[PDB]
Design a binder for this molecule. Structure first.
Ligand code: NI
Length: 341
């Protein structure tokens, strides 16, 4: 059955709760963003109202084939009424179309559900600052002090300079970027922009990108692999074997590959700075691991929560074991004692 952390008290609303069949009492299902864990169970067969951003609606319509009658897209940064209750969608700084949702309950309680997010200080001057938030449903993916990472901009700058140098040294090199869902699009778009190229990709991936309201998209992406010097491949193909194989397929138009694997955190965040990063190399193929994160680091999460000062925190990630929950509760108490709420 639908867990209490996906239910909004004193409404018949749920959030990211599609895998449990019909939820008893639920009159509106919210979807924070288009990642399969969150949408799991949604298909052309679903027949209840889904509330979401415009981008998330395009994806539901076109990729999942959810019938149009059940998609209720809402604009960002706008007070809307849903089944008698005031809501606002805010940018989550996660993947394209990802939202946080603010719920103003009839009793006067205010609840923020973050969805998946990368906390940022720009969120301190949104509509959130206008009133007290009593309850917070929090993306706790990286809720432990070991999880540090560089800013997105430091990582993109590194990617840009690396790719530009390699292709100026060898104008017959191909750049490859690995991908598995939506998100982290700036990696491949910034590399292509410094090389004066479009990004080449499969028909399924192109169809996905065409839904995302990216300005001038038709000038940035193509399905003609031949004509482009940055290609997108599935993350699973980002290895020496898969990349040699791809290079055979391109018809001797390239004689070298430089590949990027954008990942989350891995253990080498605890020593290395972005400027020290060196690739793995086998022959005419190099692979760079770059920690481009679309989740809050420990320090970014702590800052946001210490600013917000919620009366109660409800974790939404890593809640499956008592050890994880206990560990998280400890950090929430420390933050509360330091900041005086
Ligand atoms: Ni996500």
């Amino acid at each position: 059955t639908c867990p209490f952390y996906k239910k909004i008290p004193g409404t018949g609303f749920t959030v990211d709760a599609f895998q449990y069949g019909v939820v008893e009492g639920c009159t509106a299902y919210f979807l924070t963003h288009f990642h399969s864990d969150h949408y799991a169970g949604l298909s052309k067969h679903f027949t209840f109202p889904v509330y979401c951003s415009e981008i998330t609606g395009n994806l539901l319509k076109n990729k999942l084939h959810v019938q149009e009658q059940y998609i209720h897209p809402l604009p960002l940064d706008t007070e809307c009424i849903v089944n008698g209750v005031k809501v606002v969608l805010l940018d989550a700084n996660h993947c394209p179309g990802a939202v946080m949702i603010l719920f103003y309950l009839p009793n006067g309680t205010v609840i923020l559900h973050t969805g998946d997010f990368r906390a940022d200080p720009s969120m301190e001057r949104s509509l959130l600052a206008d009133q007290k938030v009593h309850m917070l449903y929090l993306d706790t993916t990286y809720c432990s002090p070991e999880y540090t990472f560089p800013s997105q901009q430091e990582v993109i700058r590194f990617a840009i300079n690396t790719a530009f140098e390699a292709v100026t040294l060898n104008p017959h090199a191909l750049v490859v970027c690995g991908t598995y869902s939506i998100g982290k699009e700036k990696v491949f778009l910034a590399i292509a922009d410094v090389l004066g190229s479009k990004v080449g990709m499969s028909q399924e991936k192109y169809k996905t990108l065409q839904c995302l309201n990216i300005p001038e998209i038709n000038s940035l992406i193509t399905t003609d692999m031949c004509s482009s010097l940055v290609h997108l491949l599935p993350m699973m193909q980002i290895n020496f074997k898969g990349l040699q194989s791809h290079l055979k397929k391109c018809g001797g138009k390239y004689n070298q590959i430089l590949a990027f694997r954008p990942t989350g955190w891995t253990h080498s965040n605890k020593f290395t700075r972005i400027a020290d990063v060196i690739p793995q190399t086998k022959g005419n193929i190099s692979i760079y691991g770059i920690p481009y994160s679309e989740h809050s680091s420990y320090l970014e999460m702590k800052r946001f929560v210490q600013w917000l000062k919620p009366q109660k925190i409800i974790p939404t990630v890593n809640v499956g074991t008592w050890k994880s929950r206990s560990t998280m509760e400890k950090y929430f108490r420390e933050w509360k004692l330091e900041a005086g709420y």
